[PDB]
C-alpha cells in the first residue's frame, strides 16, 4: 500500500567473503570504495550465491571489481572510471610493475573455492520519496463485485 516516487536497482557480483560488510556504515574496502549504504535508509540489499553461473575454473575474468580508492564513496555516490592506481610513488605509466597494481581487477574465480569464497549476486533496491506524485504503487485490487 505504501506508494513511493522513485526506485533504483543496482546489481553485481562479489565474493562470499565480504557478505557481512553489507550494512549501513561498515568498515572495509567494499563498504566504502564502491558504495557506502547510508546509516538511515529506506530500501535494502538482497544477495544470493550466484557461484555456478558466475564462476569459471580458469577464472571468471568477465566479472571484475574496481578495487583501489583514496576516498570513501558516500551514499548515493557513483564512481565508475578506468584509471590505473598509484600506491608507492608513481602509477608506473600504466603497466604492471613494482608495487603498482590496477584497481579494475578481475576476481580470478574458481568453482573449486570453498564456501567462504563462493561469489554472491548482490543487488540493492533503493527507495526515493520526492515531491512528485508517488506513482510506483502497490495494485489497488480491487475486490470482487
Amino acid at each position, epitope marked *: 500500500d505504501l506508494c513511493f516516487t522513485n526506485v533504483y536497482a543496482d546489481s553485481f557480483v*562479489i*565474493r562470499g*567473503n*565480504e557478505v557481512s*560488510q553489507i550494512a549501513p556504515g561498515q*568498515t*572495509g*574496502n*567494499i563498504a*566504502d570504495y564502491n558504495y557506502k549504504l547510508p546509516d538511515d535508509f529506506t530500501g535494502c540489499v538482497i544477495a544470493w550465491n550466484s557461484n555456478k553461473l558466475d564462476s569459471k575454473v580458469g577464472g571468471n575474468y568477465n566479472y571484475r*571489481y574496481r*578495487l583501489f580508492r*583514496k*576516498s*570513501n564513496l558516500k551514499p548515493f555516490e557513483r564512481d565508475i572510471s578506468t584509471e590505473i592506481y*598509484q*600506491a*608507492g*610513488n608513481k602509477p608506473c605509466n600504466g603497466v604492471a610493475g*613494482v608495487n603498482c*597494481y590496477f584497481p579494475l*581487477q578481475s*576476481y580470478g574465480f574458481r568453482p*573449486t*573455492y*570453498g*564456501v*567462504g*569464497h563462493q561469489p554472491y549476486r548482490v543487488v540493492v533496491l533503493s527507495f526515493e520519496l520526492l515531491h512528485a506524485p508517488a506513482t510506483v504503487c502497490g495494485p489497488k485490487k480491487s475486490t470482487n463485485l
Partner: single-chain antibody
Amino acid sequence: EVQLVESGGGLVQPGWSLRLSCVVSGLKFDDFAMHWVRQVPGKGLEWVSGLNWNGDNVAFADSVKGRFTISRDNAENSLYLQMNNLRPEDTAFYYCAKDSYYDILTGYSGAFDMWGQGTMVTVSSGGGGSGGGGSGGGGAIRMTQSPATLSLSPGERATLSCRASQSVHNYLAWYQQKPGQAPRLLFYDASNRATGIPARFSASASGTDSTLTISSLEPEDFAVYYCQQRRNGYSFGQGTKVEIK
C-alpha cells in the same frame, strides 16, 4: 629505504596512560597504512591494531577494544597509540608495521613488509592480574605446521607445510625472525617470490595447504618461520623455531 623508529617503551606501574610512537621515513607514508603488532617474550606473535592510510579502516584487538586509542599523521609520518587502565599482561614487545597492500575484495592488507625495531613495554611493578574469560579467539584451530619444530644442519633441504583450518584463498604470509635480530619478510601470498629472494627459497600455496622449501641450508639461516593468515581480525601462527640440530 623505509626506516621505522619506535619510542615510548620502558617500565611503568600499571593503571595509568602511556603513549607509543612510530616515526616513518623512506618514502611517501601517506599512501600506506600503519599497524601495531605484539610479541609476548619467548612465544609467538599476536596482533594489536591497525589504522588505514586515510584512517578509514580502524581495527582493534578484542582485549583492548574500547580502551586503547590509535591515531596517525601522514605529514610528519607518525603513528600514535594511547593506552589506559594498564594490567600486567600488557608487558610485551611492540612492533610497528608498514602497509603491504593486496588485491582482493575484502580490503587492503597490512603486514610485515617494512619493520620497526620494536620497543619493550613492561607494565610489571605491582601485582599480577588476569581474567577467567577465554572466549574463542585463542582457542581457534591454528594453522598446523609440519613439522612443528625442525632442527636441520646447513646444506640440505628443509620443507615446512602450513595447513589452514579455513579457506584463506591465496593470502598467506611466510615470515622469518632472526633471534635477537630484526625479522625478515620471506614470501608474499605464500605463492609468489618476494623481490631479491635467492633461488633456494621457494614457496607455494592454494586454498589451505602451503609448502615452503629451503634448499642448501646455511649456518645463518636458522630462525623462526611463520605462516600468517588474514581473514578477519588477523592473527598469527604458532611459529616454527628452526635452529641447529
